[PDB]
Design a protein around this ligand. Structure first.
Ligand SMILES: O=P(O)(O)O[C@H]1[C@H](OP(=O)(O)O)[C@@H](OP(=O)(O)O)[C@H](OP(=O)(O)O)[C@@H](OP(=O)(O)O)[C@H]1OP(=O)(O)O
Ligand SMILES: Nc1nc2c(ncn2[C@@H]2O[C@H](COP(=O)(O)OP(=O)(O)OP(=O)(O)O)[C@@H](O)[C@H]2O)c(=O)[nH]1
Ligand SMILES: [Mg+2]
Ligand SMILES: [Zn+2]
Lengths: 145, 48, 54, 852, 173, 456, 30
């Protein structure tokens, strides 16, 4: 009923079994309901950062994929004229990973990260004595009329 | 755990803590565990 | 130091032995920005918890 | 015919035959907020109409989002048209031209290119998130483009499987959403005949993850096919809205019986939907087959082995069936386009409905004079040839037929923006395949090959050798302003032509893209945000020009304004030394620039109504209010040219002799502006005096246009000039705990939070804020990184606000690579733009006088 | 290093709460995984080594030896104490005459042997030109060479520069 | 009505009128309705109000514009057409047109033409500009200029404009920009004595997909091979139209006689037993050539008594000993050595010899410095033909008309070309912009890389 | 290729020469 056979190849489980196995493995899982947590921290973000020779702060650091443009070897064109550049905030590493074609000259072998996925507003149920469909107090109230 | 049917995997093939260094390293950690998170991420990314 | 590293980040955007440990010079996450050092850890509606930690 | 098309439920001869009968066509734009379910809804309609095209189990087939950047980003970037044949609840098949538009607010322009060729709108609303930024903006832009508005409340499963609301409280959530859309439509429209309620069929409820789609009529027809004797339309009239069911009298009452009974929507619609979703996701093994037997659904043993989300999609595909409530809604509440031809011609045609061609375009007949209108250019993936996409409003395009494409600068007196192009091929554009047709009659959408050369943004295709009095359709008035400005050069200058070629191509692909070259030879792309320009830059480097391209830092375009009247009344004589013009520049009244820009006034009005507006609204004398010459750099621009020339001092016929050239010089002067060559805004230019030469070869043209620009510039500069910042309105969707984090992120970037309001019925908050657009670069990255992805922001252009500095302040030293403080930001913003523009280092107020 | 990484990953989640520092943490699946994935890769290396065990820069020298071997195979085998030294001196003499831009035509040499020496001289000529230019880019770039490499290189470049200069003079004529 | 009486026609200077480049607005990039300002040469889009030409006219007081497509002159900001015959040379420099009487008498032009600046030139003997590393393509394009029938094809746009293209076909840009360049090079009333080939080369860069760049020089034989094959591919209308002008001018038919040599490492009994196997017999794989590849014998590795130059030297007939039916050439691929004989069957009217200079040895690319001793006014190629053929070929005597010469190392090389001006008998060495008058006796002293010959 | 794989053609044509021409090979003293 629950596995393939003696070869132990395919399993099919009842959802109470999967629920209690999920509860027994609660300590090994982060209870994220999204991959929004991995914004600029997923694989694409790190492939991008490796391709741009940039290091995301919580992330890895590699050898340069391409030979870098030395910004003391480029020779003050009308393009990179620093008297034309309005500085408001420092354009971080994260902005060149987040928008690799806007903020990088030569984005090569670069990976467009996934944008927002919509925020999974899942209310974990603390009390099983509560109905499964229940207006939890995390939910903001709907003021009638 | 979002599955209810699946194919059986080797015990080698199940990294119990891969989605731990794939998180951001928690606050208040010393520097060696932070570089350990970043280098686990480095070889994760080099594998992928 | 962090204002110094901020303007350094601007100014550089535009202008045998078996070692068993990783160095602290291998580190990243040495940020100047207070939005990126103190990075508001997920309160998963106050009901989800980070893996492994007690 | 003659092409290899996928297997479909209909057949393409029936699609090509529904194309002819333009009563059975619905030109529909599916528009909404970002990720509110539109592409997955088109996926559901494609899976309904194509049996071999099926979504994968763990990953949603998009089937629009056919670009690589769309598949990698996950954000819809371009509008993809999909022409299906969808059956109605009564079983009647209607041809549906559906524009799946991007819901990201930066790509709002793309929605406008879909709103022009549509007769109706389905506004998609996340049932969890509710009404968001782009849902309000596309309500506004949909009722302002004179479109019929319907609502699909998508993602109702988030009320069930995420929020786990009670069915009464999720009914309150859906009712709050419908009330919010009704309030927005009553805000942006004086008419209240377009009330949106599901009782009317205007509101559809959906879950495009699980292929739920019902109106009240299509859910009532599930009862009508389950139980025979019930008439489902009368039932659908009772299903929503504080109507309770009395099961002892079997009658629907407005008074609640039992003091704990539910509404008809909760009892008959929401609780069955909850029980279906709860029996699938909770009790598949134990009690799904008996409830599936109760619903009439039998699944195969292979099908019950599925995971819970594909099993939900399958169970609701068998229960709800086809998406006939969507077709109910768009057939009853979106025009014909025979019916919708007359508001379309009244709104978007320049000749109006009263023309001899506007009449024949209101009739929408395929045997009429050809009046196609293309708003989108779709590149083939080799990048070389574009295909103009739009609707045939009269006549019939034919493949191989020579045709007269009129660009946006074609007027009937300036007939040079036309070109006779041979139409190569015609395609009925479904998203991942094109049905090549020999002809396309009126009312239908068409991809046209061969007319791509003489047009950049927007075309009116007519026929040659007739339609000599054929005018263009209006250019796309966009929802927002392309403000973010990036400079773009090739890494190797030798492949500049490829980049220039590619620049032309991104000018075709993105409808509100502005590619210009500044006077320094700097190539400049204007966009609506950083995701928009990231996709533009991706297409520029990868799709169109295969070369490497340096980007500059993103900067914004500024405006220029005045804050007080001009100190001395400024003057300029021509190089003849005749024709002195004497102007002052004073700031406009508050809200007047918003009135000229949002077409609350027009110079196309007569002098009586225009003078009556300016008298009754802004305390102008009728002396001044009957003396308005023009309206800023375009016909709807935020400046006014008034002549306060008394007829005693000036001959008024001699002044009307050069009114055209003074208006042209004023429009060019407000288009460039003397501070940093960026648009003058909110400035009233009063012509105080005007010497005019007597004979017409001494006035006019090459004398008085640059003289009028010089007196506009000097009158502007003697008034105290200020720069204006574009301000982005930022709607942040954060959790309740991340609100103070959003405040902290905004406080580092000059952003003022307007509001932090709870999303009612969701655990999230919306922080509405006003960031400057020069300070929004990496703001969403700052926000989503600092909040660990939990907060998410969409920022769209809202207004222009005066920069806190003074731009004509030589006292201010600016070290070149530092973030300047606020009280001289304008001095940083003026000269660097002037350096970018390449103009002189500083502009003096005496540069355009005659004394120096 | 990776296993130490996983130790730092595991311990600092293990040693939270009331658990302090100490030798009591054993969550061994991560490191055990890493060492098995190493065993995956070196299993066929050690297997190939046991299958092998438990069984049963100087192109002128190589080129000169190969061309000497190719003449010395096709000799009449009655003569190899006589002519194998003389044809080596003919090889070195043709190479000395190529390095000198002077005519090398031995009239008594038979034209297949002459054609093979010509071929040898062309192969050594192309190698010699290439190694002179390569060693010059090495020396000029700043790579560390000794006295005889520079001396040798300078002799090679002097003969190459005078071949180019003689070609320049004859192009002027 | 104020046409023929425009005041601003003195404001035109033809010294800035460069009509060699992309006809795009210099502000909006648009090819639609581009107008040259005749006061500064800069292109701007539109002739109406709020266009870039209008705003430019009032911004700079530059009050005369030429429609770059319609060839009609306009005064902006105030607008009217200009009808003046003195402006006709501006349109003729922008769009040179050649009548059939002007094409037939185009090679009978002994008198020099004057440019607008005081610089005499001959039409066709016109310098091509050097962008970074370009002289291979300037040399080949100057070689395909001064070929009369290919020129006469590309001087009338009507010869090639109406032929059918695929929808997404970039390869026809070579045909139309080659025709534009040919009309600019043979323009007898130019404004300067030199033509920038830059648009033609951007068509080359786009059509070869960054083969044959302008920043990096290629080989002239590779560029001529690709360019004749690409002109022949693109002048076929949505098919292989078998005879284009490139085939009608340059293509001949050779008859290759491939013979498989058995194997060298076998005994003699098996070696002559393999002769009856008929895999080791002669074939006839008769094909068509655009150009004949002439293989020089290698630089002789030693100087010799007789002549005292270090420069080796072959007659033309000794490297045209290949392509008679007697001389066999060894071909050597993996496992197999063939003995290819060649035999010219159809001799083209304009025969290209691509003399193979650069061969790669084991280490680098070496240029053969051998000087082909060719005559320039008579080669009877009658005896390189079968007697099955020599009754068909009435004229087989060829005169040299173009000689592309590569100078220098294979790395740091340059290209010049000695073109024979017809009408005169004078030969001109064009190295990209400079035009020297070279003597007829000095052509055969240079390293002939590519040669084009005319059948008379 | 290897070296004798380049010299194989000349080795096989070097097999052609007669033994009257083998000891009449001069030395380089001239
Ligand atoms: O990180 P390592 O260089 O490999 O050394 C660690 C580390 O000791 P240090 O802090 O002195 O470097 C651990 O201590 P903490 O990381 O917890 O501070 C300690 O673990 P415990 O103190 O919790 O026992 C562990 O010891 P072990 O791995 O044997 O459990 C020990 O490794 P060493 O045995 O190599 O010293
Ligand atoms: N819970 C839930 N999620 C859905 C539903 N419909 C779509 N989604 C998810 O929400 C995300 C929305 O993506 P799309 O629907 O493809 O995007 P869109 O709504 O067209 O908006 P754009 O990205 O601007 O094109 C997808 O990842 C879907 O997986 C739904 O009905 N319920
Ligand atoms: Mg979409
Ligand atoms: Zn000009």
């Amino acid at each position: 009923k629950y596995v393939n056979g003696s070869t132990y190849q395919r399993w099919q489980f009842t959802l109470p079994m999967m629920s209690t196995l999920y509860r027994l493995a609660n300590q090994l899982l982060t209870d994220l309901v999204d991959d929004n947590y991995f914004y600029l921290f997923d694989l694409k973000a790190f492939f991008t950062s490796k391709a741009l020779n940039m290091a995301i702060p919580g992330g890895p650091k590699f050898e340069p994929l391409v030979r870098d443009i030395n910004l003391q070897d480029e020779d003050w064109n009308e393009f990179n004229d620093i008297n034309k550049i309005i500085i408001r905030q420092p354009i971080r590493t994260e902005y060149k990973i987040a928008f690799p074609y806007l903020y990088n000259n030569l984005p090569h072998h670069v990976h467009l990260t996934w944008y927002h996925t919509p925020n999974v507003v899942f209310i974990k149920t603390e009390d099983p004595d509560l109905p499964a469909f229940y207006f939890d107090p995390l939910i903001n109230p709907i003021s009638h009329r | 755990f979002n599955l209810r049917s699946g194919r059986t995997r080797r015990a080698l093939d199940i990294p119990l803590v891969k989605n731990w260094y794939r998180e951001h390293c928690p606050a208040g950690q010393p520097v060696k565990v932070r570089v350990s998170y970043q280098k686990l991420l480095k070889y994760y990314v080099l594998n992928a | 130091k962090d204002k110094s590293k901020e303007l350094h980040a601007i100014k550089e955007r535009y202008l045998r032995k078996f070692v068993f440990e990783w160095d602290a010079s291998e580190d990243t996450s040495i940020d100047y920005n207070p939005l990126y050092k103190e990075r508001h850890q997920v309160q998963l509606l106050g009901r989800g918890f980070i893996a492994g930690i007690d | 015919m003659e092409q290899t098309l996928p297997v479909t439920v209909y057949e393409m001869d029936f699609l090509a035959d529904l194309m002819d009968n333009s009563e059975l066509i619905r030109n529909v734009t599916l528009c909404g907020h970002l990720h509110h379910g539109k592409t997955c809804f088109v996926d559901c309609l494609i899976e309904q109409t194509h049996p071999e095209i099926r979504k994968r189990y763990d990953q949603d087939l998009c089937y629009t989002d056919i670009l690589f950047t769309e598949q990698e980003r996950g954000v819809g970037i371009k509008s993809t048209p999909v022409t299906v044949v969808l059956p109605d609840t009564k079983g009647k098949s209607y041809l549906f031209n559906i524009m799946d538009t991007p819901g990201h607010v930066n790509f709002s322009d793309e929605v406008t290119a879909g709103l022009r060729i549509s007769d109706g709108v389905v506004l998609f609303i996340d049932a969890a998130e509710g009404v968001m930024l782009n849902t309000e903006r596309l309500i506004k832009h949909a009722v302002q483009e004179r479109l019929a508005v319907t609502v699909c409340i998508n993602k109702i499963d988030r009320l069930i499987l995420e929020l786990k609301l009670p069915p009464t409280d999720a009914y309150y959530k859906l009712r709050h959403i419908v009330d919010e859309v009704n309030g927005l439509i009553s805000m942006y429209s004086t008419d209240e005949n377009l009330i949106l309620s599901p009782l009317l069929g205007n509101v559809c409820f959906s879950s495009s993850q699980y292929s739920i789609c019902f109106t009240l009529g299509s859910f009532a027809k599930i009862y009508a096919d389950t139980f025979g004797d019930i008439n489902y339309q009368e039932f659908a009239k009772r299903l929503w809205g504080d109507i309770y069911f009395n099961p002892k009298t079997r009658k629907f009452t407005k008074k609640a019986p039992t003091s704990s009974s539910q509404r008809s929507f909760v009892e008959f619609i929401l609780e069955p939907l909850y029980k279906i979703l709860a029996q699938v996701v909770g009790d598949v093994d134990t009690s799904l087959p008996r409830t599936l037997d109760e619903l009439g659904i039998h699944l195969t043993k292979e099908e019950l082995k599925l995971n819970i989300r594909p099993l939900l999609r399958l169970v609701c595909k068998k229960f709800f069936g086809e998406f006939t409530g969507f077709v109910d809604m768009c057939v009853q509440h979106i025009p014909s386009p025979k019916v919708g031809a007359k508001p379309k011609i009244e709104h978007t045609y320049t000749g109006g409905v009263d023309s001899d061609l506007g009449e024949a375009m209101s009739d929408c007949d395929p045997d009429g004079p050809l009046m196609c209108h293309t708003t989108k250019m779709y590149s083939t993936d080799d990048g070389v040839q574009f295909h103009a996409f739009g609707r045939v409003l009269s006549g019939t395009i034919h493949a191989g037929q020579p045709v007269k494409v009129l660009g946006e600068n074609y007027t009937l007196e300036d007939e040079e923006d036309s070109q006779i192009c041979t139409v190569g091929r015609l395609w009925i554009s479904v998203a991942r395949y094109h049905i090549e047709v020999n002809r396309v009659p009126a009312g239908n959408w068409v991809l046209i090959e061969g007319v791509d050369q003489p047009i950049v943004k927007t075309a009116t295709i007519t026929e040659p050798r007739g339609n000599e009095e054929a005018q263009i359709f209006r250019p796309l008035k966009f929802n927002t302003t392309s403000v973010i400005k990036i400079a773009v050069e090739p890494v190797n200058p030798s492949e500049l032509p490829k980049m220039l070629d590619g620049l032309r191509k991104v000018n075709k692909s993105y409808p509100s893209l502005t590619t210009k070259v500044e006077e320094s030879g700097e190539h400049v792309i204007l966009g609506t945000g950083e995701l928009y320009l990231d996709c533009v830059m991706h297409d520029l480097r990868k799709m169109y020009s295969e070369i490497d391209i340096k980007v500059a830092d993103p900067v914004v375009t500024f405006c220029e304004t005045v804050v007080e009247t001009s100190s001395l009344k400024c003057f300029a004589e021509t190089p003849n030394k005749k024709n002195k013009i004497t102007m002052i520049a004073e700031p406009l009244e508050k809200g007047l620039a918003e009135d000229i820009e949002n077409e609350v006034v027009q110079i196309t009005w007569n002098r009586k109504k225009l003078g009556e507006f300016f008298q009754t609204k802004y305390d102008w004398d009728l002396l001044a209010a009957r003396s308005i010459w023009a309206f800023g750099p375009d016909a709807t621009g935020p400046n006014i040219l008034v002549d306060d020339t008394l007829p005693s001092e000036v001959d008024k016929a001699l002044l009307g002799s050069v009114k055209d050239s003074i208006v042209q010089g004023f429009q060019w002067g407000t288009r460039e502006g003397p501070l940093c060559d960026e648009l003058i805004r909110n400035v009233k230019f009063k012509i105080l005096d005007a010497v005019v030469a007597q004979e017409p070869l001494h006035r006019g043209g090459g004398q008085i246009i640059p003289t009028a620009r010089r007196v506009v510039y000097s009158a502007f500069l003697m008034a105290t000039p200020r720069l204006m910042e574009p301000y982005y309105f930022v709607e942040v969707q954060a959790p309740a705990d991340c609100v103070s984090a959003v405040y902290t992120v905004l406080a580092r970037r000059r952003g003022h939070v307007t509001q932090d309001a709870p999303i009612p019925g969701s655990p999230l908050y919306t922080i509405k804020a006003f960031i400057p657009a020069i300070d929004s670069f990496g703001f969403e990255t700052d926000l989503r990184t600092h909040t660990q992805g939990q907060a998410f922001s969409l920022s769209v252009f809202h207004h222009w606000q005066i920069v806190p500095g003074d731009p004509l302040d030589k006292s201010i030293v600016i070290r070149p690579l530092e973030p300047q403080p606020a009280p001289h930001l304008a001095r940083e913003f003026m000269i660097k733009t002037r350096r970018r523009k390449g103009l002189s280092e500083d502009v003096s107020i005496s540069k355009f006088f005659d004394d120096p | 290093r990776m296993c130490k990484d996983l130790k730092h990953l595991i311990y600092y989640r293990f040693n939270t709460g009331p658990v302090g520092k100490g030798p009591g943490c054993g969550f061994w699946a991560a490191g055990w995984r890493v060492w098995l994935f190493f065993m995956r890769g070196i299993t066929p290396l050690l297997e190939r080594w046991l299958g092998n065990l438990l069984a049963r820069s100087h192109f002128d020298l190589e080129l000169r030896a190969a061309v000497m071997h190719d003449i010395l195979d096709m000799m009449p085998e009655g003569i190899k104490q006589n002519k194998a030294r003389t044809i080596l001196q003919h090889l070195s003499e043709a190479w000395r005459c190529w390095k000198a831009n002077i005519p090398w035509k031995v009239p008594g040499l038979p034209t297949p042997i002459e054609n093979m020496i010509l071929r040898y001289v062309k192969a050594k000529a192309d190698w010699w030109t290439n190694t002179a230019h390569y060693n010059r880019e090495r020396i000029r770039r700043g790579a560390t060479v000794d006295k005889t490499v520079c001396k040798k290189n300078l002799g090679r470049l002097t003969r190459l520069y005078l071949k180019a200069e003689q070609e320049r003079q004859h192009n002027y004529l | 009505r104020r046409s023929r009486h425009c005041p601003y026609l003195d404001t035109i200077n033809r010294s800035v009128l460069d009509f060699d480049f992309e006809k795009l607005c210099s502000i909006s990039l648009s090819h639609i309705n581009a107008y040259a300002c005749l006061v500064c040469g800069k292109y701007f889009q539109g002739r109406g109000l709020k266009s870039h030409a209008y705003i430019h006219s009032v911004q700079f007081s530059h009050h005369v514009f030429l429609n770059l497509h319609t060839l009609k002159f306009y005064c902006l900001p105030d607008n009217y057409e200009i009808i003046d015959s003195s402006l006709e040379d501006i349109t003729y420099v922008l769009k040179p047109t050649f009548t059939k009487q002007q094409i037939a008498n185009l090679d009978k032009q002994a008198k020099l033409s004057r440019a607008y600046d005081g610089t005499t030139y001959l039409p066709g003997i016109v310098g091509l500009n050097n962008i970074k590393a370009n002289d291979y393509a300037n040399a080949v394009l100057q070689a395909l200029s001064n070929v009369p029938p290919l020129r006469n094809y590309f001087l009338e746009e009507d010869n090639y404009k109406n032929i059918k293209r695929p929808p997404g076909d970039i390869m026809f840009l070579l045909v139309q920009r080659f025709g534009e360049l040919m009309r600019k090079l043979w323009n007898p009333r130019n404004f300067k004595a030199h033509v920038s080939p830059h648009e033609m080369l951007q068509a080359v860069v786009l059509c070869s997909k960054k083969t044959f760049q302008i920043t990096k020089q290629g080989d002239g034989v590779d560029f001529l091979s690709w360019f004749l094959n690409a002109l022949h591919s693109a002048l076929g209308g949505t098919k292989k139209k078998k005879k284009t002008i490139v085939t009608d001018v340059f293509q001949g038919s050779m008859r290759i006689f491939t013979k498989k040599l058995p194997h060298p490492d076998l005994p003699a009994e098996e070696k002559e037993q393999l002769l009856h196997n008929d895999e080791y017999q002669e074939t006839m794989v008769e094909s068509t050539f655009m150009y004949l590849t002439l293989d020089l014998p290698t630089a002789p590795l030693y100087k010799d008594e007789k002549e005292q130059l270090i420069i080796p030297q072959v007659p033309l007939f000794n490297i045209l000993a290949k392509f008679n039916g007697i001389t066999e050439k060894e071909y050597k691929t993996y496992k197999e050595n063939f003995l290819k004989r060649f035999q010219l069957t159809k001799l083209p009217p304009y025969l290209i010899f691509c003399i193979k200079r650069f061969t790669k040895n084991n280490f680098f690319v070496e240029k053969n410095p051998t000087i082909v001793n060719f005559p320039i006014t008579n080669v009877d190629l009658r005896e390189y033909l079968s007697e099955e053929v020599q009754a068909v070929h009435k004229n087989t005597t060829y005169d040299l008309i173009a000689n592309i010469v590569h100078d220098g190392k294979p790395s740091e090389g340059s290209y010049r070309i000695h073109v024979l001006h017809h009408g005169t008998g004078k030969w001109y060495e064009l190295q990209d912009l400079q035009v020297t008058d070279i003597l007829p006796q000095m052509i055969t002293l240079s390293e002939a890389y590519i040669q084009i010959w005319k059948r008379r | 290729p290897k070296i004798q794989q380049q010299f194989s053609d000349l080795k096989r044509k070097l097999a052609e020469v007669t033994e009257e021409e083998w000891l009449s090979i001069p030395e380089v003293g001239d």
